[PDB]
Structures are given as structure tokens and as C-alpha cells.
């Protein structure tokens, strides 16, 4: 009526457990080899005698007269890096200045080009991720920039995280303090005329916390031109003003120590040519600015909760509309689950008291190369850093229909959103508990 028979052993009734597990010493040796914990074979047999493979011949038979089903809970555990190549978090296109030249007697010829910089897999934490990006902009300048004109003064594109506009005085037209108040509010990206960044093929966008208000329109390009209204205002010549006590004030600090120009639009304007995203969003025209088509969001280092799909092709019936095949990247799905990664949050009031000390701690100002320029400076570390953290996930799918004849060797397969094994799985295993559902 509801048996469960196996080769030659006492028949069992009503229910039991078949175990899908990678570890088994025997099968690892033989079976999987060129496989990994995301696409492997395993014997469900569990009987000490019998050579695996020869096991493959045997079968667990759930009484034929009834349609069976089984509860499937699984234990999935990864250890995927915040920033890696497979997830698309190690690359990102941006347009920078390539050459600054003296041409055809009087012309200033500026040549800009798009280029894709890559990051060294792993390096978690958001802030640091920013830094690694800024550094990659530089590392490039080091291989092309300088040796083709282009000064530091005109480095296009830099990810910062502050509100260049806190000091700002509605009359002066300047950041009175003479310094862009060094506190971190949200990541944003700053651009110089003519350049900009593109994330079309990168989740890092999600790390900065900047998304399109219309996601499905593939094409994340944020040009200098887009950051309308909201160019970082200029600094008051704190020195002049004070010593001068008319009043100098109108004097908007044009350079800095080591004399770098703050590219001011004209000898008059209080504004600089440096455009900030964060500004355009909440300080620019809400109806036509950038706030119109992009959204200011919480960072999230994981870069985006993605899901993984399970499949047990040789043991569960194929769900409603999937068709059975043998193409690993199209197997039927039997369970979906978010990919095991969380955002742990910490507190480091030590940030920026630490950037200050961190710089001495790290024997180099590698990230802060321009410790004077109020722009190109090293963005403030925000209190509350986030870090992707891997965690085992004791998930639980529902009862799923089973085949009344379970093969000795079952194939287990965890796929990702785009349907492809996921290299970062360290442990995957599931427990199935069959039971009756109705009869034929």
C-alpha cells in the first residue's frame, strides 16, 4: 500500500530518509573528481558493501501504487568574496583624461578615453573598496596620465563620500571654513569636465549605493554632463580674509600647498569645475537633475542579494513547466534560496581619527597621495563600516514530488541567477524524507 523497498532488505513503511551528501570517502575518490561542491554526484545507497557505481545499479523503490513526495531541507555554506570576478565586482569602466597637450600653436588639446580598471579580488569593507577604486584610477594615471601631459590637478573621476557643501555660505558663495568639512555622509562620485563613469557591467554600483530608478533599462552611465547643478563650491581664502582684518572674502582659494589648481570655472565664479553626484541629487533641480533618474540608497557591500537554485534531476519530478534535459545549465529547479551572505555592521568612531592614525599605521600614504588637495584627498572613513560575511544557511524547501524509483547515484546541482555552477560553495548537502501523497 505504501512500502519502500530496497534490494534485499526488510521493507520499510511510511517514510524514511535518503541522504544527499558530498563528503562520502568512496564516491569522492571515484565519481566526482573534475566536479565541485555545486555540481556533483553522490550515492544515495549508504550501504557499506557494494562498490559505488555498482551501487549505481541498485535503486530505492517507493511503492508504486502511490504518488510520493519528500521534504527537502538543505544545508548550504559558501565563502564568496565581497569583490570578485565571477560576481562582477572586480571591474568597472570609467572615462579619464589620457593626454594634455600644447597643439597647433595656441590650442589646448584634451584627449579623454574610456577604460576598464580591475580590482584585486577579496578586499572587503566598503570604505576600503572605495579606496581600491580611487587607487585604480591613479594606478592608471601612473601608466598613462603623467607621461602624456595631464597633471594631477586635472585627474578626472574620484569616488569620495562627503558633502562638499556643508560650510557653504549663501552670500559668500564659498565654504567659509576654508576646508570641505571632513565628515562622511554617503558615497558619491566626483567628475571633471569631459569624463565620467559607467557600471553597465558591474555590481559595484550597488556598493556605492547609487541605483537607477528604472533598473531594467540596461545601461548605467553617469557622465559629467549629467551631474548638472551641483559643482563643488570653492574654499574661502581663510588666510587672506583673517590677515586682512572691505574684507578679502571674495577670494576663493585657487590652489593649495604643492600648488595644484582647483580648476575654477572662471577668475570670477565661486564654483569649481568639479561636479559631485551627491550634490546633484539633493542640491540640484529635483525635476530635471540626477535625482530624477537615480536613487540614493543604503550601501550594502554584498553588492546585491542574489539567489541560487537547486536541482536534483534524478530524484524529484520536474516542477510544473520545466522540461527534463541533460544540460547542466537548464536542469529543473526544485528550490530557490538566497545566496548565504550578510552585511555585518560595525562601529569605528576610530574612522577619520583612524584615517589620521591609519596613515601612520600603514607605513604609506598610498591611498592619500594628495594630502593637501581638498578634493583628491582621501575620503573620510564613515562610522559604521559594513563587511560581507559568509554564513551557513539551514534552509527548508517544501515537500516535492519524487520518482517512485530513486537511482543509486543522484546528481546535485546548485546554480546561480544566470544559471551556472557557483565556485564559492564549500558545503552543500540535503536530507530528503519521502512520504505518501495519494494513490494511482
Amino acid at each position: 500500500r505504501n512500502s519502500i523497498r530496497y534490494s534485499e532488505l526488510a521493507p520499510l513503511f511510511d517514510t524514511t530518509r535518503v541522504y544527499l551528501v558530498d563528503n562520502k570517502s568512496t564516491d569522492v575518490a571515484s565519481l566526482n573528481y573534475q566536479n565541485d561542491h555545486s555540481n556533483f554526484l553522490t550515492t544515495v545507497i549508504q550501504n557499506n558493501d557494494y562498490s559505488p557505481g555498482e551501487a549505481s545499479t541498485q535503486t530505492i523503490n517507493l511503492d508504486d501504487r502511490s504518488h510520493w513526495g519528500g521534504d527537502l531541507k538543505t544545508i548550504l555554506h559558501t565563502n564568496m568574496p565581497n569583490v570578485n570576478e565571477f560576481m562582477f565586482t572586480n571591474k568597472f569602466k570609467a572615462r579619464v583624461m589620457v593626454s594634455r597637450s600644447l597643439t597647433k600653436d595656441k590650442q589646448v588639446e584634451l584627449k579623454y578615453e574610456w577604460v576598464e580598471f580591475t580590482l584585486p579580488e577579496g578586499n572587503y569593507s566598503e570604505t576600503m573598496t572605495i579606496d581600491l577604486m580611487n587607487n585604480a584610477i591613479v594606478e592608471h594615471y601612473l601608466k598613462v596620465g603623467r607621461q602624456n601631459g595631464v597633471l594631477e590637478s586635472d585627474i578626472g573621476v574620484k569616488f569620495d563620500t562627503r558633502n562638499f557643501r556643508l560650510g557653504f555660505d549663501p552670500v559668500t558663495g564659498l565654504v567659509m571654513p576654508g576646508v570641505y568639512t571632513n565628515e562622511a555622509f554617503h558615497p558619491d562620485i566626483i567628475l571633471l569636465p569631459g569624463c565620467g563613469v559607467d557600471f553597465t557591467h558591474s555590481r559595484l554600483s550597488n556598493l556605492l549605493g547609487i541605483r537607477k530608478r528604472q533598473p531594467f533599462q540596461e545601461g548605467f552611465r553617469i557622465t559629467y554632463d549629467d551631474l548638472e547643478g551641483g559643482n563643488i563650491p570653492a574654499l574661502l581664502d581663510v588666510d587672506a580674509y583673517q590677515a586682512s582684518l572691505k574684507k578679502p572674502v571674495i577670494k576663493p582659494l585657487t590652489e593649495d600647498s604643492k600648488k595644484r589648481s582647483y580648476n575654477l570655472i572662471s577668475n570670477d565664479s565661486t564654483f569649481t569645475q568639479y561636479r559631485s553626484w551627491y550634490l546633484a541629487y539633493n542640491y540640484g533641480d529635483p525635476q530635471t537633475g540626477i535625482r530624477s533618474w537615480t536613487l540614493l540608497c543604503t550601501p550594502d557591500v554584498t553588492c546585491g542579494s542574489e539567489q541560487v537554485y537547486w536541482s536534483l534531476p534524478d530524484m524529484m519530478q520536474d516542477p510544473v513547466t520545466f522540461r527534463s534535459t541533460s544540460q547542466i545549465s537548464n536542469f529543473p529547479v526544485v528550490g530557490a534560496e538566497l545566496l548565504p551572505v550578510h552585511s555585518k555592521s560595525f562601529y569605528n568612531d576610530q574612522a577619520v581619527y583612524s584615517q589620521l592614525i591609519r596613515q601612520f599605521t600603514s607605513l604609506t600614504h598610498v591611498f592619500n597621495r594628495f594630502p593637501e588637495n581638498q578634493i583628491l584627498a582621501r575620503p573620510p572613513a564613515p562610522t559604521i563600516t559594513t563587511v560581507s560575511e559568509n554564513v551557513p544557511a539551514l534552509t527548508d524547501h517544501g515537500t516535492l514530488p519524487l520518482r517512485n524509483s530513486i537511482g543509486g547515484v543522484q546528481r546535485v546541482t546548485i546554480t546561480d541567477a544566470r544559471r551556472r555552477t557557483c565556485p564559492y560553495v564549500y558545503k552543500a548537502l540535503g536530507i530528503v524524507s519521502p512520504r505518501v501523497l495519494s494513490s494511482r
Binding site: 594615471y141 600614504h365 597621495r369 594628495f370 594630502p371
Partner: peptide, 10 residues
């Protein structure tokens, strides 16, 4: 005429 691009002073 070589920029090491590094503030050695400090």
C-alpha cells in the same frame, strides 16, 4: 621632470 606622485615630505 618625474612625478613620483607621493608626498615624501610627511
Amino acid at each position: 621632470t618625474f612625478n613620483p606622485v607621493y608626498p615624501y615630505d610627511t
